[PDB]
Amino acid sequence: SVRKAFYDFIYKDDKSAETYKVTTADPRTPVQGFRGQTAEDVAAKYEVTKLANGVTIITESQTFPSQVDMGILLDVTRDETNETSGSLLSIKNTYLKTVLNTNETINYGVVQQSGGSFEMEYDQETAYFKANCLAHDATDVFSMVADCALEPRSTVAASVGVEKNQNTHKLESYLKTGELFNESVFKTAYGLKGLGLPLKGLRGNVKNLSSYTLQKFQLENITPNRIFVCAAGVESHQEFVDLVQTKLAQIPSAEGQKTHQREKSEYLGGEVRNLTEESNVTLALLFQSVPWSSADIVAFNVAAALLNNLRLKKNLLQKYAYFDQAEALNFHFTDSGLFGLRTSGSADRAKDILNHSIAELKAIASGVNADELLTAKAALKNSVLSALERQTDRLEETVKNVRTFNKIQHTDYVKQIDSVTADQVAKAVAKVLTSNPTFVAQGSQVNALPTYDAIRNLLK
């Protein structure tokens, strides 16, 4: 009004203004006249439906008024061939770039002004575009999530992605991050195919990530039968179903056309020994674990919780000083799995780093004490429930549970962890140890290590 205009022209407070009173109200007492409503939490209900095409929809009902979360999960790095290795990384580096309905700048502005967040994360055999925002901004945000998650890559997007992928590769090489070491581990484990393709993609194929290759990748892999849409905090399932239908209904059914299909993954017991002249030696010893289908997966997690929390610290890090750091790796895949240890320590005692490490893993095969098992299970429960308490992570794991087991199992994770016993963990680890080892070593004196046959004999 005129009074506000006058009091803004001269930067002087308007004492009588109600907004001034509200903003300058003493924090010790509530603002006069305002008293928000009170409400109690409600049990969460999960509902799953399928469209005429293969797209699936999952909703977690509102438990308490909060920001709505949405997401799209694509079963589509395992589905990358040497022709199009690293496409998913380029998509990640330019996940906000769309040109069909909304622009890169405009959808970034949508993210910024909605006050929420929008992220894209991809693993082997999965990509996930998640977003969280206020309810009244949900619709628009979803229009961005779907397009960014389903629109074919544009030439400008691919051009930007090539540069960003090159920068990412340079940064990874400069930092010597454990991700590159894991890439080498998977290369030797599976053999540059299926799960063996590097997560960040081959560096020699970066220049080939043109819009044509990305579009070929999307056409081959992205199909309605492998698209899951998820919402969390939605009062009505049907409202979100309609919201999705308004966007993903156009996608034609892929039935009747030869599908790409995923080749069954084979495990290879290779070894890699790289001389890097590093003052520290990094070793990794892995074996084939069980897939998601097998019930032993939980046990394996407990085994990891038995190492990364209680054992591996005391037996290796505390007793020996040359152990820079040791950890237990546990990856699960739809058709295979990996479980083992990754250690790093002084190069001059590389052999001492290896033997002891094996013993620790072998100790698990020997048996587990009751107290250690209880501690590991308690720590695993704490971590899992800390993850589940946050709505976004809960929704992501809900999507993954639906896409893997066709039902929701995160509601009874605690019971599954409780059901685990020491005997099951010991037997599972003993069975895993019998598999052909996959051994990787990068260090200054990796040239002097026990032979692969000696490694197997020690493991035996």
């Binding site: 405009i106 502005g109 949508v110 002004q113 909605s114 901004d137 628009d140």
Partner: protein, 58 residues
């Protein structure tokens, strides 16, 4: 959500900057009035207030 065009943001920013800079117009006017005051006096009483017509008898 509030998604104003960058045209509008540029226009509003430049409007504020113009408002800020206009405040020095009076300052320079006062400086050039204190200075050159005889010129202002000549202008005022030659154009806006012309002298009287008649002449002294002598």
């Amino acid at each position: 959500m509030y998604l104003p065009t960058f045209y509008k943001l540029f226009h509003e920013t430049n409007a504020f900057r113009l408002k800020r800079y206009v405040g020095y117009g009076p300052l320079l006017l006062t400086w050039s009035i204190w200075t050159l005051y005889p010129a202002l006096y000549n202008m005022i009483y030659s154009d806006f207030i012309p002298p009287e017509r008649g002449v002294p008898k002598r």
